[PDB]
Amino acid sequence: TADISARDSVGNTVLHALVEVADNTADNTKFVTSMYNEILMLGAKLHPTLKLEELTNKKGMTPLALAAGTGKIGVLAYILQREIQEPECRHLSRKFTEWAYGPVHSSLYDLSCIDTCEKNSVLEVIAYSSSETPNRHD
Amino acid sequence: LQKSKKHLTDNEFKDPETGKTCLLKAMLNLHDGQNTTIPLLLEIARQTDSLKELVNASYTDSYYKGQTALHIAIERRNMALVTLLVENGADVQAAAHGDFFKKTKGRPGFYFGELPLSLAACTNQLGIVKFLLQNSWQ
Numbered sequence: 120t121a122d123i124s125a126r127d128s129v130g131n132t133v134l135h136a137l138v139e140v141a142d143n144t145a146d147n148t149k150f151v152t153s154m155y156n157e158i159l160m161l162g163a164k165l166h167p168t169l170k171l172e173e174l175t176n177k178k179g180m181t182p183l184a185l186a187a188g189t190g191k192i193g194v195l196a197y198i199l200q201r202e203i204q205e206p207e208c209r210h211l212s213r214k215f216t217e218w219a220y221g222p223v224h225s226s227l228y229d230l231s232c233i234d235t236c237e238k239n240s241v242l243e244v245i246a247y248s249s250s251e252t253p254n255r256h257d
Numbered sequence: 258l259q260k261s262k263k264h265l266t267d268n269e270f271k272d273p274e275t276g277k278t279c280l281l282k283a284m285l286n287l288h289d290g291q292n293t294t295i296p297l298l299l300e301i302a303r304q305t306d307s308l309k310e311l312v313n314a315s316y317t318d319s320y321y322k323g324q325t326a327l328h329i330a331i332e333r334r335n336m337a338l339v340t341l342l343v344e345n346g347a348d349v350q351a352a353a354h355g356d357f358f359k360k361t362k363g364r365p366g367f368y369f370g371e372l373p374l375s376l377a378a379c380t381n382q383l384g385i386v387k388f389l390l391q392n393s394w395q
Contacts (some may be wrong), residue, residue, distance in 0.1 A: 220357075221332055221366045221380055 123162045124169060130176030133158055138182050141191045148193030155197060183232055184239040190253030197223045263305040276317025284329040284338060299345055312347040322354040329382060331376045339385055349373050349389050
């Protein structure tokens, strides 16, 4: 069986590598976000106590921060508005709903790794980005 | 509850700090549009005296003040439970006064007009509109 958790030479796990391969085009974004889901969902079926997204490569970067440091807005949009409806893969959701009375519904977005966190905040990695770093502004 | 009274004892078994009798609790935690305790909890109340004080009951808190169980069935889009409750009383003029149910307030909430007929009109339930005006009883 392959190792979901294994790393490459540069420390990038599979999910990091789904971020490196993204190129901000729709068909790639449609796909990578689909495939980002499935391994990320699969890693709750097998190895249910890991939290892949917390894994840091050689440069100390998570797949979320690496999507934000490298200009990957589609993957970033996916990871941040992520809502998974399956029961045993709900904890891997990130956009929740706390109530829905009629047309109104109150969503909750996690703020892990966005606010002034430990290693690399998504706001810092976006705000303090190098100038090339595509879609700094989006 | 047969062997004491069922009447005050249900009123003492209203969830404190909310006023939820067992009836309102049931439609909250539904499964595929039915709990299967809702028919039973009506059976406890029709045999043993004072059926009205279960259906006319509502939240006691100032924040859901007046939200009878009839309002619940209208939001959850259960045509049946609207039929079931109005048979057993369940006043169709119960004013959901609560702060959740008041004008915009700059806070979370849904204003529909405080009355169950206005809830159905503002919920896309036209069947429940025509029902509440010509049902058979009230």
